[PDB]
Design a protein around this nucleic acid. Sequence first.
DNA 1: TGCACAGGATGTATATATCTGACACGTGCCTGGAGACTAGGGAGTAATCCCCTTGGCGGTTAAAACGCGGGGGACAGCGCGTACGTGCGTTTAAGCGGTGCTAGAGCTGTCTACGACCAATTGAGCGGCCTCGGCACCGGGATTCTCGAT
DNA 2: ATCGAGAATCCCGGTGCCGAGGCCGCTCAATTGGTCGTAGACAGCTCTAGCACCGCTTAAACGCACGTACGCGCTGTCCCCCGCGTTTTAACCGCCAAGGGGATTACTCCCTAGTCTCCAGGCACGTGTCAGATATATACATCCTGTGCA
Lengths: 118, 111, 270, 84, 85, 96, 95, 99, 109
Amino acid sequence: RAKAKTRSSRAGLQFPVGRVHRLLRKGNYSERVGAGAPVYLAAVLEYLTAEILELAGNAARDNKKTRIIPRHLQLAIRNDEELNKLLGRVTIAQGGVLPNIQAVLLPKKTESHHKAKG
Amino acid sequence: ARAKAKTRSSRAGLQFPVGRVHRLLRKGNYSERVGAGAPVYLAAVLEYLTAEILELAGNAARDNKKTRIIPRHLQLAIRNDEELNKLLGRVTIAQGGVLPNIQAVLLPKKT
Amino acid sequence: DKGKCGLPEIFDPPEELERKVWELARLVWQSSNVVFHTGAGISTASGIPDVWTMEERKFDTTFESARPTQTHMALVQLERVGLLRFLVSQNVDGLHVRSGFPRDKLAELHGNMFVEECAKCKTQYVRDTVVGTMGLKATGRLCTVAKARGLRACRGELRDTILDWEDSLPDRDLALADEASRNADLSITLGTSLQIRPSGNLPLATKRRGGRLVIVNLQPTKHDRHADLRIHGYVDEVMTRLMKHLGLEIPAWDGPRVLERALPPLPRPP
Amino acid sequence: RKVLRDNIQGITKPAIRRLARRGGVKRISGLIYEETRGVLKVFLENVIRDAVTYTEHAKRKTVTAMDVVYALKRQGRTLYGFGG
Amino acid sequence: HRKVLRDNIQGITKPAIRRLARRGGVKRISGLIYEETRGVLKVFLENVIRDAVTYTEHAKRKTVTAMDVVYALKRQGRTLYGFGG
Amino acid sequence: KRSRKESYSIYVYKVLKQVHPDTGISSKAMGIMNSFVNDIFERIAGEASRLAHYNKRSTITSREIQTAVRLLLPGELAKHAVSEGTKAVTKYTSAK
Amino acid sequence: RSRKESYSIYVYKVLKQVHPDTGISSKAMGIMNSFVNDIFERIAGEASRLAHYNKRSTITSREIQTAVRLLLPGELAKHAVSEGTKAVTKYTSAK
Amino acid sequence: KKPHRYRPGTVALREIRRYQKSTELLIRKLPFQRLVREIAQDFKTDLRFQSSAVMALQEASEAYLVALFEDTNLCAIHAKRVTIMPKDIQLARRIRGER
Amino acid sequence: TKQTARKSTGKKPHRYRPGTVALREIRRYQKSTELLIRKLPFQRLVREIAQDFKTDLRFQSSAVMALQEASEAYLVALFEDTNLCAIHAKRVTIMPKDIQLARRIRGER
DNA sequence: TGCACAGGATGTATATATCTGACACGTGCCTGGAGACTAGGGAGTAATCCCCTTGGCGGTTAAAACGCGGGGGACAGCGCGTACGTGCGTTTAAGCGGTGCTAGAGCTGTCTACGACCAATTGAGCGGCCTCGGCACCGGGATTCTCGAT
DNA sequence: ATCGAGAATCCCGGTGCCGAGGCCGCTCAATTGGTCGTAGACAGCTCTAGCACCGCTTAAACGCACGTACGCGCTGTCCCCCGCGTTTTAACCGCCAAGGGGATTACTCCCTAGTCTCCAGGCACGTGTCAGATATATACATCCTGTGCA
């Protein structure tokens, strides 16, 4: 019949467009859907995935590791303000928390003030 | 020709329109089919909630020496009951005010 | 700026300035890898006031219009003519970078007032105005390194490079200076008391692997011993007869400038 | 042809004190007026951004009350008494 | 299944509570905290399990699955990545 | 003229006269009650639709509505609403 | 026996596109797969509400754009809008 | 003799009692409307506002500020004080989630 | 310097002063990822709570694992808020009133 | 009593070597997305229509702003008692590995009954129109806290 | 611990008045009756995890002694906020245009839903391998202590 190129390849994407179209039409969102909605939604999903997964990769490389584990995903999400705003209340399993100690809890005062030693 | 055509709301013995509820259920994109008892059940529970709130609001209105309900009375009714205050937890009612409440520490001492 | 000044000065007698500047120019020749060390006394000629100095007592307005000294113009030309392997400065005035000295040959252990660093990618920015923050804290600007594939920028909180006591030291710099001293043939410190460590221990490790050590300072140092030549005169005038017996003269300080890498080999005689 | 600049000061000190008195505050420090104005401005701009987005999606030029109701419902703040 | 109940609240020992507080970032802990947080934890758990069971018995099942817990948590306004999907 | 507007005013009025024979209600309170009814309707409908979707099911029956109202309403309200709904469904099925 | 679809190969393709030498474990793969179909349903629900709000029955590109500009904050929203517009224009131009 | 004068703290209590039983809006109408218009000019120029829109905005803002002030009062009382200071508002917004 | 480079120049194991092991534990548990509660006691608590709604239930292992993760995250966040409340009152010890205030402001009581 | 070293003791860094279970990759199916084609209705323009938003003016006071005197409460020190962190010896039950049994979770067929859909029928409900009283204001006194004498 | 001025609040009874409540005509949505095709109820199997029990190792929970750091109570001061007058300042209220834009119809066409075939992208599965954990083996920068001199 024809060459039968996938819609994702035609749009220059990596995420599936046909799968997103089928999920949109079988999710009871509206009576009918347009032709460009799946492409736009797949592009947005791919962009968000790339943002999160590049930050996670940078965090993983920062710790002498060549694999991305949930700890790196949590670190990448939390250290970024906008992504943390988007995932404001989401719990990631095996993620832990950011290292943070309040300034009051530190002992301090154990240092010379350089005042000619009285 | 046909019968006397009672309404389904009268058949179920309740005041809310089960037909209108069924229409809004079909034409609201919730599912692909709608059962024949879902509108009746939902109308019954909606009527129950409305009756509960209206009874509490009327009691508040009588406590306030008035015979017509205003948003202040609805706010008092929904804020003085521990069930509706948690169902309508974060909801603001216009022209409702707040419950009169002053902390005990702020009240004057030596008396 | 009060009390008294309990400082002994000898100024060493003038006839022995020429003697051991001639003798120093001797050791300059057969040294193949010279690593210099610099201290606050190099900038005393420029009138740069503020640790002993803090105990005895913010000049950012003097910093923004400071002028590099004569010896600052010397070392940049020594770099541009060869026979200079590395430079280690523990000063925070930032005159070395503004003097045109390449940054790849410079190790700023205590940092620089004129340099910001990112907190997420550890890139460095060299501004022209004075960064008004001390203590590795926020600056107010943001990183602008752009990632690929049309993603967002770094947008990290830029911070200063001025350290504080008990804080950590730059890894990139400490390691570099250490390898440099281990690969040193001669070292000539200028205008520092050799007191604040771990920087102060860099010169001594020069002789550890069979090397020499030359110290130039008006005040005594806790490492006057284990040396090879002790200079006690003014660094402003001693360098004059340093360069007079070698050759050339300062080109210019044509305003603040920044140089990242070094020029291909050596112009002028080596 | 019309630019409005210094309107955040329209919420005067007596209005803030009245609002705090309804909240149950007895004695008020002198620095909370600026903080209250800042937080009010942040909340207002957060709501109005969504309201104007809702209006411009419909190709309209008038911000209806129902758009404000939807924008408030979006942030988990339902508002009864204005329809919808 | 024969045994019904005992005092299982004590299974959340004091050192576990101190470990959770340390991960939270707490330096000193009072003596009355331990009897408080336990009382908090139960109120949390029975607010989620009661929903999950409500899901489990809706599908005519007799086994609380991970998806029931994930759905119940999501309904509480508290999602959880790593078990469903 | 203008198109028709759907509202729950007459039914709320009937319920109010059912529970309080003499008290009345203003217009703003009636609008607030209309908004409350709409909000509860959409909450229950959304929860029921999600319940139906979780089980690969295409219909919203009375069981889905009952589970939704036991998920949403708390305690005594949930139990009384379930009782009222079951009573209404039994009356509807037996009478027809 | 039955096939269970997921966004594993696609996100791994994206990973190798942005970091050509970094791998990913199975737990992180599942977490990313959950994130993808969380954001999918969030945006789709916002678009469905936005379409019902205007008495329309079609989810076109405009509803998706407005939904992603309502949900994503600031720079994320602007960059996502740019990426979606680029993808739509390329898809239409390539026919 | 001295003129009648109430001790500091009782007029505030009377203000609290009077404003906790009343339901009208507390901020003036025109300043709030001008603030809304000024804020909205930064998103789309040449906009128009229905009266009900600004009424709803005011009704929501007043409730938001009243709730925030109740939380601020709780935070202030927790710290053995009776005055509210900016740090109490900051703590309340940290805990709530706005941060 | 291959150790504590830093900036400067310079009875029975001292028992450590009261509050150094605290920060050591804080750092150790803040850079870790594993769960902090014993698993069988938590499972028994979950079963006890569950059998007050429907009798004789069964649980998948993933169900109790998810419940444990959610509970630990909730408690860690609540303790962080409690620490903020305690510091606000010019203290370092967390009292039950701090937990009560943190739960009251969030809208849970 | 304070220097001057030399050498052992202490903690940190980099380099190999082994192990193991999760992962990247290749192969065989299979069913879901892509390419053609047609039908119909959803929505994009175009043109009126009226309504409600905005801008202006003006008089009247309500309220905000400014000033000033007190007073009470926020904050910084002290001082004391106890309770909470830290370390050490017991014990105890969690964690793991193993075996065994079976309850019910998924999946496949078969059939039936129950919602979707389509025409006629008709009455509950909405818009328009009147009409009367619940209520918000008007003072006038009658209590009622409130704060200073005593 | 008790009295008495005084400002503030709560009955008391008129009085307009605008909004709540009842009536009526009529489009339009709910109802009734019949057809039908598929979604879901009901059995029946398969086998997969869920539960129960036993030994062993040892990591962790537990109980106790002790000391010091921290929480809580007083005490003083001085500074910032509250209360009351007085003067501006501008909000609020009526009234009036003048459009700009939200609603409402008519009409058409192009965009999307059905359906039909088919073949390749994606999933299940087996496999060799490599990244992350542990475990010694040299190398080096500091730090502490013993043995002679003004």
